[PDB]
Amino acid sequence: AIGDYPVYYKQPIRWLSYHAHTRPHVFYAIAVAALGPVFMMATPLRRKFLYDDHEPLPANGYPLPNRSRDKTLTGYDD
Amino acid sequence: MIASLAGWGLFGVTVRAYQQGIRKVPFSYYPLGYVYSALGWVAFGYGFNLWTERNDKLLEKRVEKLKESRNLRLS
Amino acid sequence: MDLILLMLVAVGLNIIDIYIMIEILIMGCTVNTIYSASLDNDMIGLIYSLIQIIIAGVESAIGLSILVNYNRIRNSEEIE
Amino acid sequence: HFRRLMQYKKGSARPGLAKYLNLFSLSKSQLIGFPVALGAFSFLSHSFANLQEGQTATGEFAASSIASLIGLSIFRTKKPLSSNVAIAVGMGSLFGFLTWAGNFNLGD
Amino acid sequence: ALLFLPFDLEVSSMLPYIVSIYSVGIYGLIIFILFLLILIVGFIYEFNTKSLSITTILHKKNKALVKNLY
Amino acid sequence: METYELIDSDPKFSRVVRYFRPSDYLTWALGTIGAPGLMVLFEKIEPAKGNTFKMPPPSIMRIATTIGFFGGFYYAYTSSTKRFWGYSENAKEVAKDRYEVKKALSEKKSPYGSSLLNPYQQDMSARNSTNSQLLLAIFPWFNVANHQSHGIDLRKYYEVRDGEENWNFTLPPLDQVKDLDVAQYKEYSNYP
Amino acid sequence: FFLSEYCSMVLMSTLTAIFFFGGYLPFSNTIHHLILNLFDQHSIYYFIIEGILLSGYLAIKANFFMFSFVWIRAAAPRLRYDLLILFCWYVLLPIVFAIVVFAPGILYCFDALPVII
Amino acid sequence: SSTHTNDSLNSSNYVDKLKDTHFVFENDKLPSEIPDVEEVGATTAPLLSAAYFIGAKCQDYNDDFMLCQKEAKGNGPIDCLKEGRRVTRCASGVLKDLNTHCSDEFRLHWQCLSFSNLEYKNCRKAESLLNKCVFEKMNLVKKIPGIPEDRQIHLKQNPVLKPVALHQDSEVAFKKAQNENSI
Amino acid sequence: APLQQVGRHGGPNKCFGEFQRVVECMTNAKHDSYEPCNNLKNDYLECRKHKVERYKAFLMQKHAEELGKDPEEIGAPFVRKRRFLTSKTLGLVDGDDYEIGVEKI
Amino acid sequence: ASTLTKEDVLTRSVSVLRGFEVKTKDIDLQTTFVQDLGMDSLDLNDALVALEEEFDVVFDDKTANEIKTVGEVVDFVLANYLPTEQSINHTIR
Amino acid sequence: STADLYGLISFTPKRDIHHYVIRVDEVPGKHFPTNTTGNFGNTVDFENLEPRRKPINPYL
Amino acid sequence: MNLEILDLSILGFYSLISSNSFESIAILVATIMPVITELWYNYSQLFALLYTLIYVGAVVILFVFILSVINEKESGLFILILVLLLDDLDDNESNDNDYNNVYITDYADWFNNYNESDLSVIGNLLFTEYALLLLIISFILLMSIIGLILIVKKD
Ligand SMILES: CCCCCCCCCCCCCCCCCC(=O)OC[C@H](COP(=O)(O)OCCN)OC(=O)CCCCCCCCCCCCCCCCC
Numbered sequence A: 001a002i003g004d005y006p007v008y009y010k011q012p013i014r015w016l017s018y019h020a021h022t023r024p025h026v027f028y029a030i031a032v033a034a035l036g037p038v039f040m041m042a043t044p045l046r047r048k049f050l051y052d053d054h055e056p057l058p059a060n061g062y063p064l065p066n067r068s069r070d071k072t073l074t075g076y077d078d
Numbered sequence B: 001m002i003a004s005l006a007g008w009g010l011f012g013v014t015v016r017a018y019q020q021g022i023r024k025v026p027f028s029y030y031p032l033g034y035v036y037s038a039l040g041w042v043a044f045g046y047g048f049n050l051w052t053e054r055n056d057k058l059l060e061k062r063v064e065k066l067k068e069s070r071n072l073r074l075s
Numbered sequence C: 001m002d003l004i005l006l007m008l009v010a011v012g013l014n015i016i017d018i019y020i021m022i023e024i025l026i027m028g029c030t031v032n033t034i035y036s037a038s039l040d041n042d043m044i045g046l047i048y049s050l051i052q053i054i055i056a057g058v059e060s061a062i063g064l065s066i067l068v069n070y071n072r073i074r075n076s077e078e079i080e
Numbered sequence D: 001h002f003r004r005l006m007q008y009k010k011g012s013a014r015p016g017l018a019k020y021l022n023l024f025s026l027s028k029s030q031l032i033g034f035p036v037a038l039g040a041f042s043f044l045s046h047s048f049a050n051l052q053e054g055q056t057a058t059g060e061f062a063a064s065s066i067a068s069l070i071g072l073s074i075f076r077t078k079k080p081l082s083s084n085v086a087i088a089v090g091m092g093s094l095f096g097f098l099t100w101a102g103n104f105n106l107g108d
Numbered sequence E: 001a002l003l004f005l006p007f008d009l010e011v012s013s014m015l016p017y018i019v020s021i022y023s024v025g026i027y028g029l030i031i032f033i034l035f036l037l038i039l040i041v042g043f044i045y046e047f048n049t050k051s052l053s054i055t056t057i058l059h060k061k062n063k064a065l066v067k068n069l070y
Numbered sequence F: 001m002e003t004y005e006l007i008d009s010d011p012k013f014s015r016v017v018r019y020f021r022p023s024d025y026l027t028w029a030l031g032t033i034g035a036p037g038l039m040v041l042f043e044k045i046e047p048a049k050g051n052t053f054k055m056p057p058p059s060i061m062r063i064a065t066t067i068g069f070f071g072g073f074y075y076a077y078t079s080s081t082k083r084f085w086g087y088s089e090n091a092k093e094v095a096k097d098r099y100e101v102k103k104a105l106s107e108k109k110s111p112y113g114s115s116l117l118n119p120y121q122q123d124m125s126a127r128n129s130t131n132s133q134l135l136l137a138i139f140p141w142f143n144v145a146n147h148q149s150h151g152i153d154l155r156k157y158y159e160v161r162d163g164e165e166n167w168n169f170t171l172p173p174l175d176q177v178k179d180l181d182v183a184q185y186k187e188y189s190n191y192p
Numbered sequence G: 001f002f003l004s005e006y007c008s009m010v011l012m013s014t015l016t017a018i019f020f021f022g023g024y025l026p027f028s029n030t031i032h033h034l035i036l037n038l039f040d041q042h043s044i045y046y047f048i049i050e051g052i053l054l055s056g057y058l059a060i061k062a063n064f065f066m067f068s069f070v071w072i073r074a075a076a077p078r079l080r081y082d083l084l085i086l087f088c089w090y091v092l093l094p095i096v097f098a099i100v101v102f103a104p105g106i107l108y109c110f111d112a113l114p115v116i117i
Numbered sequence H: 001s002s003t004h005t006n007d008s009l010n011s012s013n014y015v016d017k018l019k020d021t022h023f024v025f026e027n028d029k030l031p032s033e034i035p036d037v038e039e040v041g042a043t044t045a046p047l048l049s050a051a052y053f054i055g056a057k058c059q060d061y062n063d064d065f066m067l068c069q070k071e072a073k074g075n076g077p078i079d080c081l082k083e084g085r086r087v088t089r090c091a092s093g094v095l096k097d098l099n100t101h102c103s104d105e106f107r108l109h110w111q112c113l114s115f116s117n118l119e120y121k122n123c124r125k126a127e128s129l130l131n132k133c134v135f136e137k138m139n140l141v142k143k144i145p146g147i148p149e150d151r152q153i154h155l156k157q158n159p160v161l162k163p164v165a166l167h168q169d170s171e172v173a174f175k176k177a178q179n180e181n182s183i
Numbered sequence I: 001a002p003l004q005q006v007g008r009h010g011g012p013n014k015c016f017g018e019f020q021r022v023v024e025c026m027t028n029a030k031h032d033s034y035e036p037c038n039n040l041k042n043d044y045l046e047c048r049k050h051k052v053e054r055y056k057a058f059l060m061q062k063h064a065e066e067l068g069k070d071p072e073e074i075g076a077p078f079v080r081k082r083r084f085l086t087s088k089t090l091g092l093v094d095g096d097d098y099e100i101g102v103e104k105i
Numbered sequence J: 001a002s003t004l005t006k007e008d009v010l011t012r013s014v015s016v017l018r019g020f021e022v023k024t025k026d027i028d029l030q031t032t033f034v035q036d037l038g039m040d041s042l043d044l045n046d047a048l049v050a051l052e053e054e055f056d057v058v059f060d061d062k063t064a065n066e067i068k069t070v071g072e073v074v075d076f077v078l079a080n081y082l083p084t085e086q087s088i089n090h091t092i093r
Numbered sequence K: 001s002t003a004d005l006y007g008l009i010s011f012t013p014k015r016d017i018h019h020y021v022i023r024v025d026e027v028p029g030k031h032f033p034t035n036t037t038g039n040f041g042n043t044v045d046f047e048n049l050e051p052r053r054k055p056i057n058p059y060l
Numbered sequence L: 001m002n003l004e005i006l007d008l009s010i011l012g013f014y015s016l017i018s019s020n021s022f023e024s025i026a027i028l029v030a031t032i033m034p035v036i037t038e039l040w041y042n043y044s045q046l047f048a049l050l051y052t053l054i055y056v057g058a059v060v061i062l063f064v065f066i067l068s069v070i071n072e073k074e075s076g077l078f079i080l081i082l083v084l085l086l087d088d089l090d091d092n093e094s095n096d097n098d099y100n101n102v103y104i105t106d107y108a109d110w111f112n113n114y115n116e117s118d119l120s121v122i123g124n125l126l127f128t129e130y131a132l133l134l135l136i137i138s139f140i141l142l143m144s145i146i147g148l149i150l151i152v153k154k155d
């Protein structure tokens, strides 16, 4: 095995190294893109050990109180 | 249902027999092709008679709703 | 004066000219959609317009790809 | 007719444009033959309808043959009259059969 | 040149996600990644067939001289 | 028609896989090894090259297993889904679903689960994935969110059916369960 | 045409300063406030000097790339044409299509999805 | 956002030319039976400055006006005019109060906002002066609902986003009160 | 059910409210037929195009001619140029007819 | 397609032959070239090249020393006439 | 019986502008991506929604 | 004096006298630009830009790319003018006289406190509400990438 092409289901570690020496533009492109999903799936670790999420922004119009109109309201009349 | 399945099994044999005439070979060539064809078209036969038996239970129930609708027009 | 099919005179006399006319015609349907979406103040219509631009883009590529292969065919002798 | 004339001069050395423009190339008489026939068909059709209080196969057969013969005798002059009459009688039967069958649909 | 038209429509169709990256939240982000993974297969396919390479087949051919003793 | 109890009109992806009957894995087992077998059988019916039997390349036997694996999963996925919709026998599943939903209500937790999606996106993710299995043959789509448009009445988990009194569950009223529509809009009717 | 070429060199130099080097923003806010502390804000002389500082802050940044355009021309030979097409498609595109997914992943992981204020 | 609509002035006079836009006046007034009210006469900068103080003083009246809209079932403009005057009168109350009690601090704030693109992050120093003066004359406290008390943005001691250009009057008034009031 | 008529800010536009009442009327179980929802559908198309309302304006323009009425004395005064919305025209007490600034906000 | 027939070549052949010094103005299929028209090497080449310019058919080196009659040339054009390939614009539009 | 069966199935009930099947199973606009309560024109209240029109499955 | 009309009158002329493929390509650009400009004013500014970035920036410079690989070979004036003048008589694509000659207005509302661009709404709907449209369009673009290679690549 002086320079043989590694077999992917027999030598997974050596198969990665072949495409890390001879095709640098392919190996390190995927690795940078791999951190995207990897960090996304690590969010549930952050929700408990670093800080909790912010409250959702009030982007639904004027917040309408969940009640009925107050009849007794007076003042600022005509 | 063995009466019906045997019918398909014979129909499957005839397809294999008709195939030989297409391929221009004696009808006694590789006799297993008749057994394989008979088993194959029995399998389609079993799944067909179920499909017809299943239809009858569906069609009659839809019929009942249709006769009521007809009686409204016939009134 | 459109019922006399006047637009056929305005088209060029090559296959590449036919391709242009189709894209102009499809562009007419997008400008109408943007007209309808904006006046109604509807963003569903503007989504349709975005899809029309994208879809009509792909059709342009496939047409020229066929034309380029077709044109290469005549000059495909490759003796030297 | 004028629009296709403009296309001949856009390109004529190309066989294709001249080939298919010949298919749609109406003659000089056909430019009068058709509007006369189509015009006469619509006048004769309605005129027979009023007397008969409603379109029938006989009224349409009469109109379609006379409208064809008037039309045919314009752009089919270089043919025997017997040939034109048979065609005019022939095209009358297509419309009579169409009207006997009730146009394209029986409707109600 | 022909392959520029697809990939340019891909990039120019990511504009809606730029101005709405917040409000769509996680759901838009997962959809966005799928919208690329489908287009990555297009990227993968052109990579393997070597469709981009100019290629040199018309020339640069060699052979080994072999004696033909009789 | 052979209807049954409607467990969940939009079953979740994690729950569909959980409720796989032992037969369902067998179906997945067949499909994963059926695809390599069908390639072999095709060579038996007619060889690709020549007139004699020749086993297909080992490389093809690897890809065919992958097709069978992602192919045989959906037959299991569709078989389990029909039990949720009520199209298939679900006596075994109804017992399991009612126990978990009752356990959820008893612990003052939502039956559906906490969500990262604002109330609109839950509604949006309901419409995209509901009934998607009817096209699962054509292209995949799954209900992976913890939304609440499951088309049920939660009071059907309150009354005690036969063989359930032993679980000794206590269920609070719906206005006190975390992550529910009725117990979320207490201050502003526009915001949860 | 020649004037068209060089306006791009100015524009692309300016765009690089706008996107990556903060645009007209000062190098140091301490020095920036000291200079603007000397001019009364009620006289228009303040707003003449303010524009000079912010534009000069953008100009120095844009100068370095205009210098860089000449700098690279005087130290790098020409690149064979066929390797230009095989460069962006095989190398630059996969990298630029990877940071386009690396950026949202990090921002969402720490709950920092940007908004327009 | 800045999309051409049919309700307000568009981007350029060419847009008005293509649309043949006419800007139409109405010379009438409200019918006599509808009671009269004095409209609020403040522009953008004063209101953005006083948006939270108007909220504190008029909180019960903002909600009733918006609740009336919901209960009008699409008939809001005719069925909530009486409620509409309550909000206007209460809003005029705060602007008048800020003019006779905290007049100096008020102008210092919204003049800072006019100086710095109306962005709330660019006038913290002119705002801390106004909040303290209002709390000592009108009992109105600025509050941003939804988050804890100690996470409100205007109380952050080291905000990450500071203005590029410091307002001079804001710095002078802050330092003038830096030693006098805040010994 | 999928959204239609979404305004430019993500919420319902002018004519969505009239669109919802059509959907509610049609899908309701109490109606034997769709005859009740005929006026509701006529209002939705009215909202989008105002065709009936524009017709009523055509008659009023046409009818004002036959009595000899002049649009100067019945019409609504308008200004056609956006730079000439002068403070004198706006009614400001001290205002003067100079052009207003619309070059840059 | 090849629209040339035998008569069409024969009819137009004479006009080219009427354009060169020929002993007799009567030329048909049986007429020779070197004998009847009294043409030597250089004289005969111009007429043969001239028919190449009108009939648009190239004569090879094999037939060069093997041409003896004018009927052969007329029959040769039919066996060797093709229409020049038309560009994509002319063919289909 | 064969004639009576085909008489029922081959009948085509009349559909006009008054009666036809619409496969809309809910009401849109309960939640909007942003600004859910806009001009307050959305009068339909989903808290008190009248029962919708259920489809009639003929095989059940 | 709408100067937009004059430009189209010119384009309605060079389209009739177009001879070679240079003229037809220039018709496409001379059609896009009146489209882009009339959209920049009037109706929608976002899609006036989205035209330029996609139409001109992707397809039109690909039109002239392939055209250089295709070929370069080779009534009167009163008829062309007569055709244009008669074609110009009627230019009302609609026939609702009330809808054309009557102006309208809309009333602004202050409810949408969350003002956002039209592109943000499109993203907020195309990526959530109508995700299937987006994922099919990606699938179509995938087909073209594989489609374009198989047609052209000889090997
Ligand atoms: C300044 C003015 C500028 C106007 C620009 C256009 C100029 C005119 C150009 C030619 C116009 C011909 C078509 C006219 C409009 C199309 C027909 C139409 O819409 O109806 C109008 C006319 C009469 O309609 P009317 O009875 O009045 O309807 C009132 C109902 N309340 O309908 C008619 O009766 C017209 C007669 C048509 C019937 C004979 C022609 C049809 C047969 C030849 C068709 C050509 C071949 C097409 C083949 C079809 C392909 C399958």
Ligand SMILES: CCCCCCCCCCCCCCCCCC(=O)OC[C@H](COP(=O)(O)OCCN)OC(=O)CCCCCCCCCCCCCCCCC
Binding pocket: D022, D023, D024, D025, D026, D094, D098
């Ligand atoms: C100028 C006016 C142009 C009107 C165009 C109308 C367009 C739609 C036409 C419908 C049929 C589509 C045929 C394709 C287009 C027709 C092409 C054409 O019109 O060219 C004429 C063509 C060639 O004519 P030719 O004699 O060879 O050349 C003359 C040169 N001086 O001659 C033909 O062969 C054309 C006739 C094709 C056969 C059509 C028959 C259709 C059925 C008619 C009879 C109905 C059958 C049922 C009758 C009983 C029931 C009613």
Ligand SMILES: CCCCCCCCCCCCCCCCCC(=O)OC[C@H](COP(=O)(O)OCCN)OC(=O)CCCCCCCCCCCCCCCCC
Binding pocket: L007, L008, L010, L011, L014, L015, L018, L022, L023, L026, L027, L029, L030, L033, L034
């Ligand atoms: C910045 C404006 C510069 C304008 C330069 C050209 C001005 C002439 C007017 C053209 C614009 C009218 C719209 C029609 C598109 C052009 C079609 C055309 O036929 O152009 C003709 C042009 C002039 O040549 P001419 O002698 O008039 O025609 C016979 C040539 N054998 O011959 C040509 O083929 C044109 C050669 C240059 C092509 C450059 C690309 C076309 C112009 C794109 C920018 C102009 C945008 C459109 C502006 C007008 C909009 C109506």
Ligand SMILES: CCCCCCCCCCCC(=O)OC[C@H](COP(=O)(O)OCC[N+](C)(C)C)OC(=O)CCCCCCCCCCC
Binding pocket: B003, B004, B005, B006, B007, B008, B009, B010, B011, B014, B017, B018, B049
């Ligand atoms: C050299 C050879 C030349 C040909 C010689 C002739 C061969 C005769 C074969 C006789 C077969 C036989 O007997 O079949 C009999 C069986 C059994 O009938 P059953 O199931 O009880 O149905 C009851 C039938 N009633 C109600 C009429 C009694 O039906 C069959 O299998 C049916 C044959 C298949 C029909 C094709 C359509 C099926 C698929 C649908 C695609 C749209």
Ligand SMILES: CCCCCCCCCCCC(=O)OC[C@H](COP(=O)(O)OCC[N+](C)(C)C)OC(=O)CCCCCCCCCCC
Binding pocket: B029, B030, B032, B033, B036, B037, B039, B040, B041, B044, F044, F045, F046
């Ligand atoms: C056990 C239950 C399943 C039945 C089997 C079904 C698949 C058939 C595989 C058998 C092995 C095989 O194909 O073997 C090969 C044989 C014989 O080939 P030959 O034509 O003589 O060629 C020469 C072979 N020598 C060299 C060995 C002689 O071909 C057949 O038998 C052909 C039968 C056609 C398929 C019948 C099934 C139809 C199903 C219809 C459903 C719609």
